[PDB]
Amino acid sequence: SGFRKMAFPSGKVEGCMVQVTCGTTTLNGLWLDDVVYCPRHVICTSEDMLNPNYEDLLIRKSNHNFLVQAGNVQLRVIGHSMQNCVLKLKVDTANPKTPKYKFVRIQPGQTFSVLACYNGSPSGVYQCAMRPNFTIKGSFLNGSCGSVGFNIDYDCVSFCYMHHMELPTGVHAGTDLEGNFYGPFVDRQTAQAAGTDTTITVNVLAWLYAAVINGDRWFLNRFTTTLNDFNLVAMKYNYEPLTQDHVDILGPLSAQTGIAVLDMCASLKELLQNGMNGRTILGSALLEDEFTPFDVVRQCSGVTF
Amino acid sequence: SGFRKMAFPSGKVEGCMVQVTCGTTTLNGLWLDDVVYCPRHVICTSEDMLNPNYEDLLIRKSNHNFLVQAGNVQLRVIGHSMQNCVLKLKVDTANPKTPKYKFVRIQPGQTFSVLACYNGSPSGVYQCAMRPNFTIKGSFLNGSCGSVGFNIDYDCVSFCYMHHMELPTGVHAGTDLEGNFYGPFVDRQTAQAAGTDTTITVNVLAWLYAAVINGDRWFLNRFTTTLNDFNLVAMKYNYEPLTQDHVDILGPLSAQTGIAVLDMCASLKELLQNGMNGRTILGSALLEDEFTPFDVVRQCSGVTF
Ligand SMILES: CCN(Cc1ccoc1)C(=O)Cn1nnc2ccccc21
Ligand SMILES: CCN(Cc1ccoc1)C(=O)Cn1nnc2ccccc21
C-alpha cells in the first residue's frame, strides 16, 4: 500500500539523449534509429527570438553546423529537415540503444513522465499532467529544451512531449514529436495567452478511489448525486465537465471499491463545497488531479515494463 | 523555473535488478559485480513469518535452491551468506551493467529515490525521505521487497535502502545494504511500534527558499525570530529542533535569496501558528518536508549525472 506520484523508469529514454549545438546554443536532442530530434530554436540567436524567421535561419545552416554528441562520441550529420517546430538531423549511425517506440499526441488531462536533461545528460525524472489548457507545470531551467515526456507500455516507449518554452507566467509549453505545439503557442519569446485552466475531474475522482483503496475513508459520505447536479457544481469550481466516457473509465475502480461513481462524485461535491477542514488525503491538503484512472490501476496493481 | 518532486534517473539501477526465487517466494535482488543482494525473508514460508529462525531456515538451503534470473538469463549461484537481514548470493558472472557504486547508511531526514520493482522488473520511480522515526512513506505492493533506494553523485550510485516490510500501520521499513534495519524494526510479521514522528524542519525551510526562488512570495513577513524562540514553536508543532548545523547548510539558499535564515524561520513560525488561509505554496496546501537543502540547490541549479 501507499500512493506516490510515480514516474516511469527512465533508463530506456536516458540512452536516447544527446547534446545538440548550433553556434552558441546548446540544448538536448532525442536520438532514435538514425534521426536526432530537437527544438528548432537551437538555430536562433538573441537577436532572433522576438520573431525568428526559422526558414531563413535554417537556410544559412549546413549539416556540418549541427554538432551532435552522445556522451563522449560525436555523431556525423548527413541531412537536416525542419518539420513544424522540430529539427530532424539524419545521422550516419543508428542509436544502438533505441528502444521500441511510438510517437503519440496525447490528450489534455493525460499524464506522462519527463526526463529533465541538460547538455544531453539526464538530471531527474518526474510525473506530470498535460493541463486542460495544454500547458505543463514542470521544472525546467535554461538548457532543458529538448527534454522529452513519455509513457511506457511493456517494452514500448510512447514519446508524447518535447520541451520548448517557458512562458512569462512560469508555465511550460512544448510540442509532440512531429513538432506541433500543444495549445496555441508559438516558439517566440513573447507574452502568449494560455487561456483558462481547469481541474481534471476524472483524475480527481481516480485519486479519491486510490485514497479509499489505501485507507483514507474519512471523506466518504451518506450522499449521492446526478451527473447534471455534479456538473453544475463542477462548473462553479472550474472543474472539467464529467461525461459518461469518464464514468466508464472509472468503472474498474468503482468495481474494486464497491463505491458507485456517482456516490464518489457526491463525496467530491462535498469536498468542493466544504473544503477539507484541515484534513489530508494521501498526504495532500488539496484535491490532486495528476493521476489518471489508468495510473491508479497500475500503481495499485503493480504493472512492470 | 518550477519545482517538482524529482527522482534521480533510474537507468543505472534498472540494469542491476534481478528476480530471486527460493521455494514459492519471489522477490527482487540487486546484482552488483558478482554478488546479488536481497532480503533474507525470501527463505520464509507463511508458517515462518511470526518469528522465523533465519539461521535454521538458511541451513536447509543450498546454492542451487536460490533461483536468480536477470531478464531472461539465469545466473549460477556459487555461494551464499547471510549478513544481518540480507542474503548475499555469490554468482559466477559479474554484472556487465554494474555502475560505479557505494553503500551508504543515510541519516533521518535525508532523501533518496526508490525504484519500485516486481519480479525483477522496474515499475516506477519516486522520491521520498527517511522519516525521523526511520520509516518511509512509500508505494509498495507485495512482491516489491528487494526494491532499493539510492542517490546519484555524478557517475556514482550510492545505495542506501533495501525494502523489507510493510508495518500494520501501512508505513514501510527496510535496511541499508549491509542488512541493518533503519529504526527498531525486525523482519517478522508483527505489530511493531515506530514511535513518534516529526516534521523535518530544515527541509521545510529549504522548500520555503525554493518557493521564493520560483516566485511564491506571499508568506514572507515583516518578522524575525531567534533559534530558541523558533525551537519553542517547533516543539509545539512536532517539528525537529533546528541547530546551527542546519542554519549552516541553509547558507547557500539564504545567500541566493537574500533572506536570512532566522527571517525565514519567522515566516515558518507564522505559517505554523496561522495555517495557510487556503493559499498554496509550490502547488501544495501543506508544509512540504521531503526536499533537503541540497535537493533544492540541485533542482534550482540543474546538476546532471
Ligand atoms: C531561450 C528559449 N526560450 C524562448 C524561446 C525562443 C524561441 O522559442 C522559445 C525558452 O523559453 C527556453 N526555456 N524553456 N524552458 C525554460 C526554463 C527557463 C528558462 C528558459 C527556458
Ligand atoms: C510478506 C513479507 N512481509 C512481512 C515480513 C515477513 C518477514 O519479514 C517481513 C512484508 O511486509 C512484505 N511487504 N513489504 N512491503 C509490502 C507491501 C504490501 C504487502 C506486503 C509487503
UniProtKB/Swiss-Prot annotation, chains A, B:
> What residues form the catalytic site here?
41, 145
Activity regulation text: Inhibited by pyridone-containing alpha-ketoamides compounds 13a and 13b. In turn, alpha-ketoamide 13b (tert-butyl (1-((S)-1-(((S)-4-(benzylamino)-3,4-dioxo-1-((S)-2-oxopyrrolidin-3-yl)butan-2-yl)amino)-3-cyclopropyl-1-oxopropan-2-yl)-2-oxo-1,2-dihydropyridin-3-yl)carbamate) inhibits SARS-CoV-2 replication in human lung cells. Inhibited ex vivo by michael acceptor inhibitor N3. Inhibited ex vivo by compound 11a and 11b.
Residues on Cytoplasmic side: 1-305
Subcellular compartments: Host cytoplasm; Host Golgi apparatus; Host nucleus
Reactions catalysed, semicolon-separated, are:
TSAVLQ-|-SGFRK-NH2 and SGVTFQ-|-GKFKK the two peptides corresponding to the two self-cleavage sites of the SARS 3C-like proteinase are the two most reactive peptide substrates. The enzyme exhibits a strong preference for substrates containing Gln at P1 position and Leu at P2 position
Outline the extent of the Peptidase C30 domain.
Answer: 1-305
Q: Where is this cross-link: Glycyl lysine isopeptide (Lys-Gly) (interchain with G-Cter in ubiquitin)?
A: 5, 90
Function, as annotated: Cleaves the C-terminus of replicase polyprotein at 11 sites. Recognizes substrates containing the core sequence [ILMVF]-Q-|-[SGACN]. Cleaves and inactivates human TRMT1, preventing tRNA guanine(26)-dimethylation of tRNAs. May cleave human NLRP1 in lung epithelial cells, thereby activating the NLRP1 inflammasome pathway. May cleave human GSDMD, triggering alternative GSDME-mediated epithelial cell death upon activation of the NLRP1 inflammasome, which may enhance the release interleukins 1B, 6, 16 and 18. Also able to bind an ADP-ribose-1''-phosphate (ADRP).
Q: How does it assemble?
A: 3CL-PRO exists as monomer and homodimer. Only the homodimer shows catalytic activity. Interacts with host FBXO22; this interaction promotes the proteasomal degradation of nsp5.
For this entry, the protein name equals 3C-like proteinase nsp5
Q: Which residues of the full protein are shown?
A: 3264 to 3568 of 7096
